[PDB]
Amino acid sequence: MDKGQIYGSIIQRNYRHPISGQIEDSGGEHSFDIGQGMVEGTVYSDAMLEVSDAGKIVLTFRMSLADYSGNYQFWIQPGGTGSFQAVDYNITQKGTDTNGTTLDIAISLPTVNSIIRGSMFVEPMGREVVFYLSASELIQKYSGNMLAQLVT
Numbered sequence: 001m002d003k004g005q006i007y008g009s010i011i012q013r014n015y016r017h018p019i020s021g022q023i024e025d026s027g028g029e030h031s032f033d034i035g036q037g038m039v040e041g042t043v044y045s046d047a048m049l050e051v052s053d054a055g056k057i058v059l060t061f062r063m064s065l066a067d068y069s070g071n072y073q074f075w076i077q078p079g080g081t082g083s084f085q086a087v088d089y090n091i092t093q094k095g096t097d098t099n100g101t102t103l104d105i106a107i108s109l110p111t112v113n114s115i116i117r118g119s120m121f122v123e124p125m126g127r128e129v130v131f132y133l134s135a136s137e138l139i140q141k142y143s144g145n146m147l148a149q150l151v152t
């Protein structure tokens with residue numbers, strides 16, 4: 001583990017891609033209001049951003065409703081443009097809220113200037129969903145219970 005900084009971050013949660021304006025989820029344009037609420041209800045806004053002095057970055061976000069979903073896959077898109085690049089993730093912690101299991105998902109980023117695309121199957125919906133996340137509004141001092149993967 002390396003010298004660096006641990007920030008609090010606010011996750012921008014998007015049903016509609018913030019750069020292209022396109023919705024990839026099969027719900028499409030006519031479902032924007034329910035889709036946006038669904039992303040917001042699933043992914044917590046408060047997150048952790050680790051930046052080592054050497055330049056490595058790890059973003060941890062928290063997913064609610066994990067008892068109802070699965071087959072998580074993630075892609076990175078630097079600058080929010082160009083191709084989606086498949087990326088590994090690690091569950092660094094599990095917790096609980098009023099909906100059951102929560103998962104802390106850690107993903108390495110080439111830059112904070114990055115879109116994360118996620119997809120997963122949702123059991124009660126009987127279909128897979130596609131959404132976008134990105135980190136902003138950095139807070140110098142992280143406050144919360146996520147577990148640091150990278151920096152001391």
Ligand code: HEM
Nearest residue numbers: 025027031034035038039042065068069122124125129130
């Ligand atoms: C975060 C990603 C998600 C997106 C983008 C999303 C999107 C949507 C959309 C567009 C609909 C309208 C029906 C349809 O198009 O199939 C819907 C319905 C529904 N979703 Fe999701 N959803 C997400 C996550 C979840 C999760 C994790 C659950 C598990 C509890 C869930 C439970 C439901 C239920 C029960 C309905 C039908 C009831 C209703 O009309 O609201 N969703 N969702």
Ligand code: HEM
Nearest residue numbers: 033034036037038039040041042043044064065097098099
């Ligand atoms: C019996 C019917 C419903 C059920 C079981 C249900 C369940 C849920 C669940 C489990 C969540 C995830 C966040 C949380 O646990 O607090 C959620 C979020 C949400 N629901 Fe419902 N819901 C229902 C009806 C509705 C209706 C009628 C509306 C519209 C007035 C609505 C609007 C929203 C919105 C906007 C969110 C996102 C809130 C957030 O940002 O955390 N829901 N719902």
